[PDB]
Amino acid sequence: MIRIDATPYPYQFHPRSTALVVIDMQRDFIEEGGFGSALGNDVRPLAAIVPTVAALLQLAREAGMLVVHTRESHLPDLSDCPRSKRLRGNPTLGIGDVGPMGRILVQGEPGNQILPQLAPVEGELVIDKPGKGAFYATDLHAQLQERRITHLLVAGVTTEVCVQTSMREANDRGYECLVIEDACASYFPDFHRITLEMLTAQGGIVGWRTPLAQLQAGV
Amino acid sequence: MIRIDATPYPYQFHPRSTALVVIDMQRDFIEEGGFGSALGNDVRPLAAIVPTVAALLQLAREAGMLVVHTRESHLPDLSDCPRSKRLRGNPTLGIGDVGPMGRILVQGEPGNQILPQLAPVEGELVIDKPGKGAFYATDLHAQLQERRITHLLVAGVTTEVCVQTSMREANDRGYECLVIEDACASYFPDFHRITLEMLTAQGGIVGWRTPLAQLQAGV
Hints:
Two copies of one chain form a homodimer. Chain A is 34% helix and 22% strand. By secondary structure, chain A is of the alpha/beta class. In chain A, 51% of the residues are buried. Chains A and B meet through helix 5, helix 7 and helix 8 of A and helix 5, helix 7, helix 8 and helix 9 of B. Chains A, B: Keywords: Hydrolase.
């Protein structure tokens, strides 16, 4: 039983019944000249968390905890990609179009791959999700129930989209979720900040948040 | 084909493939002397939208659109209520305890009921949901697919919790969602405003938003 100083009150977990979930740490969103930059976004806040996510992964692997990685991705034939999502915003470079690191949001492309320095090792779960929420159209809920997981440590990008959605999904499904605040990032500083406040608002309506240092202190 | 002025760009729908979703307009959350007020939340901003929500309901009923209502609710034995949800916030009066309008978040209690001013009528879907998201553990998705619904008009409370969760779920599932901005409300005005900005961010990443007057204009 490990007790972590957290907002809005201390967070308790057992490593055996806890998993680390690292959401969408994908080359196209984070690397200089990748698709993120092209759309005009500041990738720097995302690159700046890479060392903290790496230390979270090493903490989980040392503790022998389950590790889940997610990738936002579609089948190369775009058959799991809703028409709504493909048309949304009439993008010049849309899902499946050739971007700087290959076909945008497509399974097996270089830009779709998880950063090498945070990449999955053998024994870790890897979920390809067609939506922002890690639980929609995936077997993530079933896989965690098979492993008797009750508690999630959450990290990744972006805070107000995939992280928030996945965390809201997990909260509804009965998981106790701790987002590691310095291991999440957004293209929008204000969205990052208000999302973290929303998640722990009203006595922890979605869950808990703490910096890496409080997690390391607990273990 | 009705065309509505909206952010981030005009929203087009056909009434035969469009449903109004009115989320959690329940007595304990909105009435003076309800559990919401007892907890020290100021319910006046939720009460303030009831006439706008009733106008939106009357608009959808006159256009013959499908109308879906949601209630956050649990079986009296709380067998569909995760233990996490019951312990969260170490509450003084928690789920299933007796509040000013009956057992908190329990089906059939006066507090659990949708406001008479927004009551469902015959031929409307009424969804009881054990979470914040209208799609989790409901047949909502299957009911909308069965009736060939592709577009949702979205209203209710609270903006940053059940409205935002339900809209993010609906986006992932391939629905085109227009949140009717003055027909949603939050205990926290800044969470209300910034939720609307996140939902339409990045050229419409979750969906569209517009005031009721713009929807009234298109019909």
